[PDB]
Amino acid sequence: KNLVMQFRKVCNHPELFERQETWSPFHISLKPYHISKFIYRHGQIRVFNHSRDRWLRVLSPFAPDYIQRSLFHRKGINEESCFSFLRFIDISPAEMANLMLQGLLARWLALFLSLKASYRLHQLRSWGAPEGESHQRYLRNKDFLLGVNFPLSFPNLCSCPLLKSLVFSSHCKAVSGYSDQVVHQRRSATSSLRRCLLTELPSFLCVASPRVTAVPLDSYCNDRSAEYERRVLKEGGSLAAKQCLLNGAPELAADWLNRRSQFFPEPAGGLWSIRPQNGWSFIRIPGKESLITDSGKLYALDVLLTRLKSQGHR
């Protein structure tokens, strides 16, 4: 209003006049952050102090020599020392050193194996009640791992099937909470009510997206070895660390490669444990219901056709 066929097209359906585009976020990318060969070679404290950083590690009380010497070679008939708890947690002196000196990968692998070990500990802890561990004295290895004894601990919650329903909100199910649900039969048109059951949220409710989705700002450097280090980072920093985040542990990667060959495989643990409502990408393909909802005539037609189908009319 601000030829005649353009009005007729818009009356029939706006898809005749302007097709709804497959919208997707603006994909900005910046120049990479330029670090000179000079700062890369001489300016990294991790490198130019490496000979000094060694002495921070040689004087470390986490050295397995000093753990052993602090733990078993004490002088006093009674004597306080640190690492005394390593006899009551499962941890070895070299497990504690590796866990302290080898960073968040060694943390993650040691966690995944402690999840496994908790199921072995729980069925011991909850049935081995009679007599005693030796002479009715001596604390046994793992006696400080007490967090399994809570009724709601994951091993006990998996062992007893009732409580698993009170701990309903698991981390990868979109549970809204409890509701009533009504079921309708085709025969007789009769219906009945199911009282307080878990619900997923509606499958369509994730609809926001960033207006802009930038590439992670990389660092570029004028040095052959610096190029290899950024190539190792964009590959994912090692085969173990990548499998650990992607599949959940390197054992779950070696299993996932052959879950193909199993009838009853377990869940994946890493990022592939997730399936978000739309997939990970932010593009918003126009769903085919948008044909019905953009045209007043097509919406009117759909209520006529759903009636006429149910009446049995051609």
Partner 1 sequence: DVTRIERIGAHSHIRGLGLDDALEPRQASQGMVGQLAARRAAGVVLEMIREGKIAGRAVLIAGQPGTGKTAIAMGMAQALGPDTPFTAIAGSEIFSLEMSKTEALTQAFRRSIGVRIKEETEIIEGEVVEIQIDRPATGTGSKVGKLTLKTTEMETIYDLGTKMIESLTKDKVQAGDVITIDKATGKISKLGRSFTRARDYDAMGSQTKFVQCPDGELQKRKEVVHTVSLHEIDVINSRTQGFLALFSGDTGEIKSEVREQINAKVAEWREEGKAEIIPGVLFIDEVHMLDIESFSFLNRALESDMAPVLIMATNRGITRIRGTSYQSPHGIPIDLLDRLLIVSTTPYSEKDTKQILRIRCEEEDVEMSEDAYTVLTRIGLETSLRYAIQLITAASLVCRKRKGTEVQVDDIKRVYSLFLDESRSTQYMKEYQDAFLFN
Partner 2 sequence: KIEEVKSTTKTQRIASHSHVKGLGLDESGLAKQAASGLVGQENAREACGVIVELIKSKKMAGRAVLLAGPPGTGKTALALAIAQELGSKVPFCPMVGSEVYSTEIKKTEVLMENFRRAIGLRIKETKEVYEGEVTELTPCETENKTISHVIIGLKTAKGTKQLKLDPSIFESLQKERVEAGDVIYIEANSGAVKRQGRCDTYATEFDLEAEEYVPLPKGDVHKKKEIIQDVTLHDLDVANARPQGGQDILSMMGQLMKPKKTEITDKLRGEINKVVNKYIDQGIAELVPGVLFVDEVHMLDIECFTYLHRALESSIAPIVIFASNRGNCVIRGTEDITSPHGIPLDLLDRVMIIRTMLYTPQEMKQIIKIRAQTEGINISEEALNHLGEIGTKTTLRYSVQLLTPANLLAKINGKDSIEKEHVEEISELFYDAKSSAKILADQQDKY
Partner 3 sequence: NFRRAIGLRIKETKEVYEGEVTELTPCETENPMGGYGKTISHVIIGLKTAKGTKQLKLDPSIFESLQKERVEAGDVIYIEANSGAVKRQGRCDTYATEFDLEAEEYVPLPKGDVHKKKEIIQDVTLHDLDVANARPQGGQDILSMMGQLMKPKKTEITDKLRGEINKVVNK
Closer of 190 and 311 to partner 1 (Cβ): 190
Name which of partner 1, partner 2, partner 3, none residue 42 binds, using a CB cut-off of 5 to 8 Å depending on partner kind: partner 1
Q: How many angstroms separate the CA atoms of 66 and 220, rounded? A: 42
Q: What is the DSSP letter of 224?
A: H
Q: How many angstroms separate the CA atoms of 266 and 257, rounded? A: 13
Of the listed pieces 122-130, 172-180, 257-265, 268-276, which binds partner 2 according to CB under 8 A? 268-276
The one among 14, 112, 174, 286 contacting partner 3 by CB under 8 A: 112
In the complex, minimum distance from the CB of residue 60 to partner 3, in angstroms, rounded to a whole number: 22
Stretch 205-264 residues interacting with partner 3 (CB under 8 A):
245, 248, 252, 255, 262-264
Q: How many angstroms separate the CA atoms of 161 and 181, rounded? A: 23
Q: Interface with partner 2 includes 208 (CB under 8 A)?
A: no
Give the residue from 169, 146, 171 showing the smallest Cα distance to 156.
146
The one among 23, 38, 72, 85 contacting partner 1 by CB under 8 A: 38
Which residues, 6 or more positions from 181, have their beta carbon under 8 angstroms from its beta carbon? Answer: 193, 194, 197, 199
Count of residues touching partner 3 (by CB under 8 A): 54
Q: Could you tell me how far CA 28 lies from the centroid of its own chain?
A: 27
Q: Interface with partner 1 includes 6 (CB under 8 A)?
A: no
Q: How many angstroms separate the CA atoms of 7 and 289, rounded? A: 23
In the complex, minimum distance from the CB of residue 140 to partner 1, in angstroms, rounded to a whole number: 31
Stretch 133-152 residues interacting with partner 3 (CB under 8 A):
141, 150-152
Q: What is the DSSP letter of 293?
A: H
Which residues, 6 or more positions from 242, have their beta carbon under 8 angstroms from its beta carbon? Answer: 235, 236
Q: How many angstroms separate the CA atoms of 278 and 28, rounded? A: 22
Taking a C-beta distance cutoff of 8 angstroms, is the pair 291, 297 a contact? no
Amino acid identity at 203: S
The one among 68, 102, 176, 199 contacting partner 2 by CB under 8 A: 102
CB neighbourhood size of 158 (10 A):
14
Where does this chain bind partner 1 (CB under 8 A)? 33-39, 42-46, 48-49, 161, 169, 171-176, 179, 181-188, 190, 199-211, 217, 219-224, 226-227, 233, 260-261, 263-265, 267, 274, 276, 280, 289, 293
Where does this chain bind partner 3 (CB under 8 A)? 104, 107-108, 111-112, 115, 119-120, 123-124, 126-128, 130, 141, 150-154, 157-163, 165-172, 177-178, 195-196, 245, 248, 252, 255, 262-264, 266-271, 273-274
